[PDB]
Design a protein around this ligand. Sequence first.
Ligand SMILES: *Cc1c(COP(=O)(O)O)cnc(C)c1O
Ligand SMILES: *Cc1c(COP(=O)(O)O)cnc(C)c1O
Lengths: 321, 321
Amino acid sequence: MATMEKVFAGYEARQKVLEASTNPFAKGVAWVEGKLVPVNEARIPLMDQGFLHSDLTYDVPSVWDGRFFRLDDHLDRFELSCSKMRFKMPLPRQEVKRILVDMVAKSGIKDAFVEIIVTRGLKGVRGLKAGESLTNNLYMWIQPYIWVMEPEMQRTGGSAIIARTVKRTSPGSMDPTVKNLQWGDLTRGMLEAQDRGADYPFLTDGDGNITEGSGFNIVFIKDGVLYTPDRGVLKGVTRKSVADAAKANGIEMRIEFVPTEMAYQCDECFMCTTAGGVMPITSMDGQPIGDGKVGPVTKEIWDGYWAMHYDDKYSFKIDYE
Amino acid sequence: MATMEKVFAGYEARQKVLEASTNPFAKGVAWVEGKLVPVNEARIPLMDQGFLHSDLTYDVPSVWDGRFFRLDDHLDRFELSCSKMRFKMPLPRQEVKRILVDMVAKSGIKDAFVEIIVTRGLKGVRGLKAGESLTNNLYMWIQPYIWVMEPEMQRTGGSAIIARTVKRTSPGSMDPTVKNLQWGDLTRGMLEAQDRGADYPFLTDGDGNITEGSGFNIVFIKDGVLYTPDRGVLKGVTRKSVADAAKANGIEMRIEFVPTEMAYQCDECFMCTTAGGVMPITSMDGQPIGDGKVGPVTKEIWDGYWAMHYDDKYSFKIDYE
Ligand SMILES: *Cc1c(COP(=O)(O)O)cnc(C)c1O
Ligand SMILES: *Cc1c(COP(=O)(O)O)cnc(C)c1O
């Protein structure tokens, strides 16, 4: 569309400038043990329990056109995730925010993926002896904005399959509201999608309901109403932003059980996530969804989501000096 | 017992020698990108997908009294795990074996924990573009033998709870026969055990059956017969060695559905794993199991397991030169 072309033209112009930069942080920068290092040189201890037992939680805010998007909502969710895991995040919130902004500013990156991780640290829960306390670790980094669905694919939509060989990890085993890197099911789904000649996997709960996919929530549009699963999934900030844009435009959105049959009967579909935004799906199990083009309500939400990036209710300008 | 005292006296004597060594590898040694580094200096790339999405498998053989125990069974299982994950292990099997043995020899460690990991590498499955191929990474290390249950606790047994707040990750989400580091459920179980004043968590499948715990298989003894769960668990090498020792002594062992009620009706119980061996459990949900002492069949298996460490069918001597 018109607004797709706007957003992407601006991104492509900024990318041209960034690709030409000699700033050693232009390809990204990490914070490790209080030091900034270029991201592709960053290393972590082999003995970190975030590696050894994936005992960590994380969050991913973003920067668009030099504006941090919903950073506070990310930090709020991350505090909740840290508490549910019994971590103590090693630096106060305000210091974390200041460091993230300085990192961005230092790098010159205008459109950024940001990741924050807290891990159990160098000593595990399994080994704990009487009297001992654990010190948790923090890792953060900025890189150029990652696209789960590239811009050119967002214009046409991508393809999906309903995964048949795996189901989403039950909340009784791992709470899917705690953003985590334990992607065993998600990775199985990706491999299935590859095998089946589809771009993206949608996992069910194994009981006839749609959940989420490999790093994204799932939204269906049917008879002018948005539907998205309630249980079994991460409470996305992108999905919240979709609800905000729906409300702003008078579009109903239901957060509820979504049966698998919706994937075959929907009028439109899109995935949503911070790394990419609103990502239309125009094929399902090898068949076009309607006419196979990106639908009107999807584009209305798409435009609304990107407009929020310039609204001071949901974003703030970074001073790059 | 008599054989407990034998094994542990030998270990304590060897540990005294190791604690006195100035070898820079005596605290452990890792192999990273073809170089040996002291384990507590070893680092991995932040961008490794083994960290970023826990997209890895691993295995843990061991060395006892300068003898590698069942190394081939570990390498066989690890090949299977690598294939199920669609990894190509970066070095041939024979080279991996030679490197592991050289590492041990170089370190001087007689009683060792060994870990081998293969990860998806520096590029993820999610990001894959048309035409691209992935190169997987290898990490290996040796350290002094880790005890999931310390020697002194093996003499008395430890305590367990049947976990009520978590269930083992279903094979429909993550195959538990592929040894993995995605411990979300296991870590929840450990925290529950701590909360409940018990040493170890036993997880159910959420359908009335016992599975495994936080890095160990679970064995019950009832009316002179060993019972251990079939589905939902890793096919331990320790559990296989238990079956071997049972057979050698005319003790029946059933690998089958184990209802939760067995935890409350058993005559004896033990956990088993490479990092510790045979680990008696003498309390369950806060109540002693029988007289609360380590039982006779448990000790018969315990002695048998350690005898196997000196049998050339199941072990080989390392030349330390
Ligand atoms: C990150 C993520 C999402 C999206 O959450 P956002 O807050 O919108 O970025 C959805 N599901 C999974 C599994 C994720 O990892
Ligand atoms: C390693 C492990 C076991 C034990 O396997 P062994 O081959 O005997 O060391 C059992 N269950 C889990 C979850 C494990 O990680």
